[PDB]
Amino acid sequence: GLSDGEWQQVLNVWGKVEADIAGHGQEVLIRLFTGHPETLEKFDKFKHLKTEAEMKASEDLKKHGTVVLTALGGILKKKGHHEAELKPLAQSHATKHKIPIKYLEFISDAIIHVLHSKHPGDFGADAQGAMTKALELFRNDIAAKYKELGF
Numbered sequence: 001g002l003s004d005g006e007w008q009q010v011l012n013v014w015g016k017v018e019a020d021i022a023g024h025g026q027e028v029l030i031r032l033f034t035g036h037p038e039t040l041e042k043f044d045k046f047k048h049l050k051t052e053a054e055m056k057a058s059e060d061l062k063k064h065g066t067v068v069l070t071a072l073g074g075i076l077k078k079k080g081h082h083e084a085e086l087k088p089l090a091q092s093h094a095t096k097h098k099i100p101i102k103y104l105e106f107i108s109d110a111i112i113h114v115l116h117s118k119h120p121g122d123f124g125a126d127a128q129g130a131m132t133k134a135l136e137l138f139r140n141d142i143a144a145k146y147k148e149l150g151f
């Protein structure tokens with residue numbers, strides 16, 4: 001698990017995303033889409049955006065980026081006690097949305113990437129560490145609920 005120093009390190013860095021949730025989420029989602037075009041075809045309200053320009057001008061995209069970073073933030077604030085908040089995300093993405101855990105590993109990396117691009121030289125090596133372990137916590141706990149329902 002994660003220690004309290006690591007969690008505070010995780011929630012410190014989340015102070016950077018909250019200051020611009022629409023900016024960070026937009027860039028996270030665009031980073032997932034162009035690096036992994038197969039993930040875009042899971043979004044049927046973004047399936048059309050064929051270029052990085054359209055995706056950057058699209059505002060339903062910034063909206064959804066806000067709701068993914070809003071909902072992911074609220075889980076990190078649980079500090080591992082996220083079962084109530086993760087459980088319903090685990091099930092919508094397994095049954096209803098049909099989202100490979102691999103794509104949850106894709107966006108995990110995108111989030112780190114987008115932090116470095118947006119905060120180079122003040123996203124420290126311990127803070128990356130911390131943020132990685134909780135994004136890996138987050139995925140492993142989705143994964144358990146994926147296998148439980150055979151996804």
Ligand code: HEM
Pocket residue numbers: 039040042043044045067068069071072089092093097099103104107108
């Ligand atoms: C990793 C962090 C993620 C978070 C916090 C998150 C959260 C959410 C939330 C809260 C919703 C709306 C409520 C719901 O339908 O359950 C949603 C919708 C959706 N998500 Fe995620 N999600 C994540 C990852 C992904 C990834 C990686 C994909 C695909 C590559 C994906 C695909 C979708 C789709 C297709 C929808 C429906 C969007 C719509 O048509 O409105 N999600 N997500």
